[model samples]
Target: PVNPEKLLVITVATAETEGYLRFLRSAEFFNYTVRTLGLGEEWRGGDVARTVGGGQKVRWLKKEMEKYADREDMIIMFVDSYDVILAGSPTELLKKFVQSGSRLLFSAESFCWPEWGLAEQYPEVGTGKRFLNSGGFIGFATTIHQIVRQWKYKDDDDDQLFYTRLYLDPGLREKLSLNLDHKSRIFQNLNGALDEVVLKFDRNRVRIRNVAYDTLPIVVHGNGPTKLQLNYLGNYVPNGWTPEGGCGFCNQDRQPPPRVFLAVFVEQPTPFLPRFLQRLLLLDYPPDRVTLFLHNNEVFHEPHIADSWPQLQDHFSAVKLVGPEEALSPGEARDMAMDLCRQDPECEFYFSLDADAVLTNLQTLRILIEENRKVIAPMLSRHGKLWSNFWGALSPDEYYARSEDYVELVQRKRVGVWNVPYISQAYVIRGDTLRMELPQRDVFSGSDTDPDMAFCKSFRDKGIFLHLSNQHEFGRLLATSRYDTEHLHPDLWQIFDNPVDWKEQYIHENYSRALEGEGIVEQPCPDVYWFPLLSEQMCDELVAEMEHYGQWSGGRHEDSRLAGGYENVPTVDIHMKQVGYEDQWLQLLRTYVGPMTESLFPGYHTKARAVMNFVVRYRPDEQPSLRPHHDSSTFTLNVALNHKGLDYEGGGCRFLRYDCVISSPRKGWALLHPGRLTHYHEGLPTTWGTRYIMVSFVDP
Candidate 1:
């Protein structure tokens, strides 16, 4: 039996990279005795990852292995440090090497590198890997010494070709008992064989199982352009993640919270600006250590900023506001924010947040800070959509394109901090990275692209990693493409974009309670469903908006608002279109009222469309009551906008068919009933004051 203690894992890394650190973590986790070499040395081997130059590794290993050349029972396992990981235990690895029955076993691949014409010289196997790979190998020290001592090439030469030449020589190969790991029981190179490998989620651990040979590879090497795929696999391989435990490495290197420069930008008119600011204030970070900077580019949003600046100004360590009157461009403002953070001596991190991002998690800032990356962003996709704040991969021309793992990362199927091509809208950058790597202020000043794209491209050019983390519930992004600002309250029109916030502000607090139990809604009469739908604030705002328009229609037979241009039963009312609120009203019915209709009226689905959505006025002098008539609709809703005995004296709905009168109408309560044949209704008279009710003829 081969003793595991007799094996030595040796790797060469010229620089300390993210990949190199990950390689060390996996090696240490598996109880391997590793000896890392050439750290902080000049990489004179050139870019062997993309080209043909890695003989420096062979030369260095040859000199190091010469010390143990006489130990026949000792094993030396060589692996590439940057993109390699130890998936299995060293005990299992030594067992697999012993089972291979070869004195020196090298990793094999499907493609012959550096010398394609030498493919025919390789021994043809019946069903296994054919070409030799230089990424990983394991052998007895005596055999490994014989193989590396023959490396007579220069530092700039190809290492794989050198091994291939020795392996292809029949005399040298047979003398040393040299062999290739054809079945991949030891080393698995992730090039041209991605289709043959899959992540095997075991009962307690995860591993990369070679499906073709049904072997679990101990040494996983990501060769060629498969580095990203390997990084993805590293998130779950071994104990990085498991079925019982999620994200074992998330808090491995959490740092103490430090001072941060928080920059918030309002580049355009955004919906729910107040709520966005409130969420920002609710972040679970040290307020005394944060410096707040606000930049607004739209004059329309100046009042919102004014209303929120006071609440944040005294709460932070320092506050700075640059409004639209300053006339700074988005690029200029972004550059200024970066420079301000870089100039501050105490600022450790710079956080950029746009007004369109809503972070629901209070620990978002702390989580991102503890992630300990150069530049990291919390993954915040559009609510219920795949459009996220970070780009998974860039196109050839450096635009947005979907990467293979974009959906998986956005949906949090695989949770980790990923190295991505671009991140924008919401990200935290180290202040030292700003002062050292990108000291200039022209990062966002390119002519062709916008500020965000230009800034991200500059970071890519500087080789700065842009990381995106989805390890926890961070937040969501708001869609702002169709936010209309020409309204009394623009947020009221955000039923499609911010549904939860819209419902909280507009719908009654007890609306959800009404949907829960069976008897929350009161059935005043036969087929007349009465429920509280709208908040008092919603009712007051609608009344204020209608009175502000001040163009009410007279109660008459000749009317041009309808398609027929005549009304059989008319009242003093104003249509939703007259005040530019028709689209929002229709959306409200579809979002809020549709569920109620489906619950109360069984086996019926209303289209929620209506050609008549208006607010009617009932005064003793103007139209006091309406004649009994059949409504041209599948169903109808009458919402009381004002209270009885407070805003008016006597006003309610009288169901002529049931002969039941709802005499006292409560404010913000809605009455729902079939409008066509079963429930013929008439409006009751108003005795003293003006009574108002919002009406909609649904599914007409």
Candidate 2:
């Protein structure tokens, strides 16, 4: 009895692409003996990545096969290493080939490739997959050798056509005992019918299943456009990983480490920048060796960074400041930092940081050092989002279009260090790369070009690889989508442009409970739903913002923002629009209030606008109370801008219809109520100090 377990897995990989590395890793995972055919050699075949010629691969494989031509009992599995990944062991492959009852079994696909017209010549299949995919094939060594012996063509000829023509010949087909494996029991070619293949995981390993035919294919060939699909599938297939253990890099080599400099940039009116700097200060690195390169392109945040600059300045070896007074753009400042790191002998690495990044893990520095790449970013994302600090791949337009596994990578469905195309926001770079490799400066600055894109383009042109580490949680990206520094506390009201930042600063602690935890809203007065809305710090900030202007309307009625400004229910108030927060206030309603209204009220939804959006001040000197009147709005939001007992005294809202009143309102809590004919409300009298509340009339 001839043993059928012997196997020789051969592939032609001209260059070590990211895909080729995955191929080799998958083969090694299954413990398959592998050999390369044309590594480091020029691919003379017409661009097979786009066209129909891989004769270079076949020719290389044929020459390599000449040495093993006599092994009749051994199975030779020829796979396209760049696009194929093995999902099963050799024993199963041999067993599957023997069960197919053919000496040569070519992997099959739905579409005829390289030569579509010749599809009629191949034998018709009543069931299962059809059309031979020359990218993957398995056969006894003698039979494969006999079939290839007749092949004679230039290196650039179409390998698929040559093999197809041979398989099409009735006499040659019968003589060589060749047949298509109608079902992809072993070889799953993912080209045209990509929808038919799906990933299935068991206790042992991950496998690619032909969902249409219900077959678990051991070999997957991502033909043409499907190659990226294979790369996505290869991320988990073939026991490379399982839930029992982690990544298959149990034997991965260690990385070299050197000291790194910190290039800090406060380049915008960034939210959470103070916390960002605090996280930087928390980095557990020796202060004596550290060189801090600080660039403040945003004059708005100058005071914020300056307040703690001296305290943090003493820690680093040296500090350089290029303030916004000099009028340098962000691109110039980044390039300046790069230049400074290059000039300094002590600087081993240059770590670029944006003001919006918050490093949660203090060991991020240590991790980057251990993972050592030329350019690498710690995986940081915007909270509750898939947006990250690094892009897995680039768009053809060279902007942001997500790669296939982008959501998975950011969501941590798949975890590993990946070689990506673009990285910005925050990243570390070796100082040697600056001193030795980089030729010129201002690569981050080009006419009409995005600075991050410019720097990435230059690095890519210079053969420098950009990598990202997502092996663990490093930090997060705070939203800085836009900033209008026209007001006193412009950063406070960012609900519209930067919702994440607004939520971080203003949203109440128990807000999630209101949304997800049984939807219990705190209703103190009849028909008045009181859900937590703002933070204490936010309340204090709002008080300060109101006090800065301090031109409270003393029982006035001529308001421009209101529909009918006759004093039916007048209070000493300041409109949000007066302080440049009307748009942000409306956006806040759309994001939080609108959803909550729908969840509670069910059928009603406002345009999330309010003509009368104002902050009311209840002072003994001014109007101490609002008169009882029906509101000119569909619904109303009354947000407490000051603490009840501590900040002021005697402030409350009363629903005259039900004779129910809510007094001593907690700071940062909003009293939500209907403003129509059903619930006539009034502001209770303030006896001492001053009371402040943010009031909004929605959908007038």
Candidate 3:
């Protein structure tokens, strides 16, 4: 058998003395041993021998039970004495009872109570008959030790009257009534002796039973003041009812109650006084077991407010005022509260609650403990118009439609919240991140609008910020409150509304494809075909020249050697400047370069490919014009800087080829190829964008 010290027993003692003693005996009758605590001020009146005393004794018993509240391996028995009778050892019965997964149990007699609140509240229980046995012999499994330890008895002035009215008052009785007309059908037509109720035997009757007890009768009840009474005829003495060999309550003082740390942060001490007092009074959690870390920004001479209020002081083992100094801002003050948490050895979890936040449900704390999440923030909604106009403008429809595009864009850019151009509010960062990033001093002032953003951005490359979807609102709130400014750009709205025709206008050009020698044949001269090639010596020299000029050979503005901007003079009229001579290269090409004539037809390529009448100047900043059109004939070539891959930018050749535009050849580099098929190959206007590359054509 398991040691009795390993088990905790909890019981609710509302009224019946005889049943209460029998409940205690039943515990001993079973091999299981336990300490019992009774609820309700006193036992209710029954026959002369059965009546139990009033409020004071009940309170003493309730207090006495505290000694065993949190004991390990404890079982609690919830009982109302008047409705039950102990038939066997409770330890054995309860062991099997709990293993069956029945958190709630009902005796055969009490099962008939249609007025029981639980039965009506849960419709699933309504179809089954409810038995209101003497609320005695109710047992709890050891698992309920924490709940029992945390349970508190509150005095409801109307509670007694409420119970009285439930059974006696006509209006109340009618209100609480349930269908009980068919006794034969409901009770299984058992003998008036009521032995069947004790046996829990009616197969058709809707009685809640533990499947474990189906094979053997473990508990028998329903023979008491309220129901058909039956005397215990058998000589069976209740099993676990043995007296403690030494002390009456030998199991007392075996376990220490759980110590809970409540960390509270307040901006102003005065506003939190009410909440402080309420927590002090209403806590089901123990006084000595609780430590209150009261972090307040107020500079009060009396740091111990609880000292004046003895009751509050009694409830809190210690009350600390973290930062009374006026130096810290609200954010810093909050940080100080968290710092205080480090001092609490017993505090497994840290809860940050504003003064206005109340602990409405104890189960909320339990859930946090159960889930074991590092931090938890309560669900909250703003009471005022706290969102900015830009935020308000973000409708669900707009957000849903734009979110995919935004995510794709960000993914393509490899950016996250930290990388984002803006920041948001209210998020729970990991403690480690907070410890690393917490401000050492006043890092922000009126002049510095976004220290948090700055701080986050500084650490963005480190990947500290992890985005979570459910916690979005929390992060937003934190951002908004901390920054007091919006990070979202107003122009972000235009992103969804304006979709650029990237496919049509901005081509995905690739030099790799052009350099592969796969497209149109480059025949600058007869019997000569242009095969793309990369010269290592030329590349090396170009790289060296680029290093000297501190710029790329391609037509880039940064190249100091370049004179004019990289873009062509957009308004220049090629037709007006040079009229009939537009086709001069073609006419001349027919005469001197007849070998390449077959490939170079008299058109733009022919005219543009001509090597005649062109001037070359080495002045540091002189603009050069090159018309935009396909190569005149076979191919054209441009070389790099005199030294090698040196200064240049816009000088790189730009061509509208293969349905897209492309530019190539860094400073000191060279681009050489065909002209006729090389559609619209033009030089970007260059100032210092000077590179020495020969323009030539080949015919194949």
Candidate 4:
């Protein structure tokens, strides 16, 4: 006979919080008609979370319940607003209430608060919750009005104590048919009993199950310091998330896209910086709503910054570039960026991105704004590593420490918007939060700490919660720890670190097309495989870099650079090791050459390791040609580094066995052939300008 329409759910909150709105969502999911009181009213509760107080909640309930006194058949359900959620509908709640066999029922916990000595006055329960908790209760409207009528005290008095004394008085308890929900069939207070509860999925929704009592708790309360645990469970319980559908609440309260001030910092020599800047420009936010501020601190990155600033400036609404010439400290630069956002009235969010983050998702900017957190970061992790942009917990010394769920979170086994202790690399901050909670521009300044640490600590000190969202795959962090800036193109060495960017920049555009079925492999001589390998710009850069070294060996029969210190046939060339590029060259061969070798030659496997890797210079005045000789290896690769007609003439390779000659080698095209018995070759005479060809003997 008990219906949901006859039930009235009431709660109180003086101000709204992230937790309060979460409560409302859960209530709405169960289709409960909720009446919220005490909103915008002064809270004289005197900090009930820390000490004895919260008589204000009782006073509000006492005065508010008087309106329902005449409705004797109405059922009243009252729960704390901020730290509570409902997992069951009103029908199930009323059915469980009818089984309790009492007109009034209050939630039960293990703690004896305010007056511990009064525990002896209560009836003993052999194996269930004993003490009364005022966090949640259900009763008939008339019965609840009678119980709350005894609250005649100051607003600062303890609410739980008044409820406890009334429950302990056997005369009033028997006359009023009052009792506790001892078995937790309806209410679960999660202070000391957090271990008793576990999340259980039924159908498409998640529910809180009290495993110890073997009951499904309709009302869950995170009383005391268990608010964090409740927040974790709230991510999935009831309908926030499901296996079939992800992030059911993401679009809730979604506002129109707001203007953002993006601050990009290149504080160190980072590899693949050009690609990072390109991705930044490709973010799926309106360019007219974005204001960009780029700060580069390394002198080695000035060229990269200069090249990108021009294209990036005109693409955005407004832009500012601060090169290394400014010599501003990291803290000062970060403070300046925040100030710009704070001073702009039209700016709604401030997004800070470091150089190492490579956002592969174009909708990262829009998704972060859709989260609606005051300060939030999309979870960015190093590719193939556990290192992430946000820390799940902190150490006792206020430094980085690992939490139990850190690995689960990073690996995406559990996904949600988490309240983290620290966030770095990239994050978005609400502009109003910056001007209100963080009014001081010195938030990034502190003694004996890095700027990020100081900034996170400042937020922690101000009780501003920092959020990290892993709801979507945003991107990855570049491995720039061991990047060396001593080379002409430092990103070339990042083949092992950043394979995506390296392939995009260094590999030829037509290389993959050659691998397709019977596509574009060219053969000027028998058994000689020729295909495009490197781009023209790549060839030009390699020639420029090798020429900058300027230490080519003299063309002679005896060479001291070789292992045996003697060469039967030597040419004027510089080894890759002479410029400390041996490892990079080997990796390039393994990554680029090995795949092509597999695709072209059937059943011919190679280690792709080459001991003889050098760029050969062929000038008619110095060394016009090489003699017909066999390479001491299984295979050989000869790449033309300059145009045959434009940069040089009369220079190519002649395969003596096939009696075929290729005298017009195009720039950046590679020629692969058997080095031993099948195809012995010699370099053609260069009768005109100078020519350059890179050579490699694989698997010697």
Model 4 TM-score (2 dp): 0.88
- The runs of at least 3 residues in candidate 2 whose Cα sits more than 4 Å from the true structure, single-residue gaps closed, are 1-5, 15-17, 40-46, 250-256, 261-268, 286-353, 368-377, 385-471, 494-547, 550-700
* Model 4 regions more than 4 Å off: 48-52, 113-127, 168-177, 251-257, 322-332, 370-376, 391-423, 433-473, 555-567, 687-690
Instruction: Give the distance in Å from residue 600's predicted Cα in candidate 2 to where it truly belongs.
Output: 27
- Give the alpha carbon lDDT tens digit for every residue of 1-700 in model 1: 7888999999998877667878888888888899987886787887775689998999999999899899997999999988898899988988888888889999999999988999999998988899999899999999999889989888899999999998999998999899999989999999989888898887667899999999999989989877656766776777767767766667634545799999999998888887788676788998988999999999988888889888898789899999998999999999999899998878899999998888888888888877888889998888788998988766657778887668988888877777777888899999989998789889887576788999987876554667888888788888789888887877776877778778877899888899775687999999999999999978988988888888887835332122223345677889998887898899889878998899988899876989889998889998888777767778888899988988899859998878999998889889998877678787888998989999998886
Q: For residue 416, what is the lDDT in candidate 4? A: 71
Encode model 4's per-residue lDDT on 41-112: one tens digit a residue. Answer: 988999876889999999999999889877778999999988888899889999999989888999999988
lDDT of 2 by residue, 1-700 (tens): 3353478888887777546777888888778888888888877887776666778777777787798799886888898876778898777777788888889889888888766788788787887777888888999888998878777888778888787888888998888799887878888888777778888876757888888888888888888765445645665687655565544542223333466788888877787666667666778777766788788888777887788788678877787788888898878988888888888777788898888787878877777767666787889998788888887655547777777668988998767666577888888888888877685887788668988889987876554667677888888887776666777777676665556666876788787688764755777876788888888878888888988988888644543222234545556788888888787778888888888787778788666878888888888887888777667778888888877777677959887779887877877778778877778677789998888888788887
- Rank all candidate structures by their lDDT, best first, as comma-separated numbers: 1, 4, 2, 3
Cα lDDT tens digits, model 3, 1-700, are 5443444444445443434555565555455454444455443433212332122322433455465544445444444333333444445555555554433233333243324454443223332333332232233342222223332334322222222223343453344232221222111222222333332322221122323222334444333231212212111223211122211211212256445556555554332233344654564555576666665565541343534356655557876665565566655654455555444445544445555343444433333333322232333232222331111111222231222123322222311111121222222223333344442323222234444344333333232222211112221111112211111211111111111211111111332233333663353424223332223333343233324334222243221111133333221111201222324323323432332333334342333344322212232354454556543335444434343224554444455454332344433223444555435555556555454443334332
Q: Which residue runs of candidate 3 sit more than 4 Å off their true CA positions?
A: 1-5, 8-69, 80-85, 102-119, 125-195, 198-215, 223-228, 232-700
Question: If scored against the real structure, what TM-score would every candidate get?
Answer: 0.81, 0.65, 0.22, 0.88
lDDT of all predictions = 0.85, 0.77, 0.35, 0.85
